[model samples]
Target chain A: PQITLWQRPIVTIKIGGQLREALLDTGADDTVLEDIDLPGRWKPKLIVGIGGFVKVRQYEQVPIEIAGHKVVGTVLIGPTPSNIIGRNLMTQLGATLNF
Target chain B: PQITLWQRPIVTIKIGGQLREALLDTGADDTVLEDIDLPGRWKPKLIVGIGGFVKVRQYEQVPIEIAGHKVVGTVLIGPTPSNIIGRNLMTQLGATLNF
Candidate 1:
């Protein structure tokens, strides 16, 4: 399925049985989500962005669903202004940018 | 035309008679360019992002060619990690996200 890239590329996603909305960000290389609770402990790391960087917890092999397709991969949790679904997951969904 | 969303959604663009590479950032609401010489005068403004905000010179109705499509709109010039083509121009190109 294809969706118009609106003012913001937003979509609904589910993680650990929790439903949340995220930005489909091709500009980002990895997935980043707002602070959330999950199983197991993860190593904390810093992610650089436009202005500065933020500290995040990197959890590997986390199961998540986007638009109905189930995907298992790394998911970072931190103080992000918005939740972002990056190329790491978009590629698995065979997402493309069309004109 | 469609392009795979790589680790970074990058594309070639021509602005003010100069060819440059830019990132297709759906997360960004407006287009941003690394420092470039553009004709005419513009007002200075600030744009907020992940960490903080940067001061930018906003030029309106600037002619630019992206993926061979001609578009004229507001283009901001400032210190940026990379050149970004945001939704302002993507919308003009009828860009969409497909899976």
Candidate 2:
């Protein structure tokens, strides 16, 4: 389905059998989920954004269902204003920008 | 054109008759450009993102041609890793997200 950008392209996602809201962010280089606990080992990482930089936990091989697609990839668990599905997962989902 | 997310969705655009590269960022609520001088009155603003927050100058009625579409809207001038065409301009260009 094609989604217009009238509002933030917020989508409902299923991560680890839990539902959450996430933004499909083309500007972000990586996927970031906020305040969610995932079962597994994660490494500490830092990412730079519009504001500055934030410390995050990088969890690899995480499976998530977003925008009608299921993908297994790296997910950064950290503090974000909201959850964002970035290019890493967006590429896996074969997302496209059409005008 | 349909753009795949295999790479950064960077596109060439014409802003104030000058060619520039910008990212089609669905994650950003507002459009932001760097290092370019735009004419007109602007107000100071602060925006928050994954990193933190940054002060920007908000310029309204800014004209830009992105993705083969011409639009005039609010654009922010400040420091960004790269120029980002956010929801503000994307919506004006009728940009949509599809998978």
Best by lDDT: 2
Candidate 2's C-alpha runs over 4 A off are none
Model 1 over residues B15-72: C-alpha lDDT tens digits?
9888999999888888999857888889998987666678989999999999879999
lDDT of each: 0.86, 0.89
Residue range A1-99, candidate 1, lDDT tens digits: 777766587899999888899999888888999856878989998886677777888999999999989999899888778889998999989999988
lDDT of 2: 0.89
> Could you tell me which residue pairs clash in candidate 2?
none
Give the Å shift of residue A82 in candidate 2.
Answer: 0.8
Q: Give the CA lDDT, 0 to 100, for residue B79 in model 1.
A: 74
Alpha-carbon deviation at B67 in model 2, angstroms = 3.5
- Give me the runs in candidate 1 sitting further than 4 Å from their true place: none
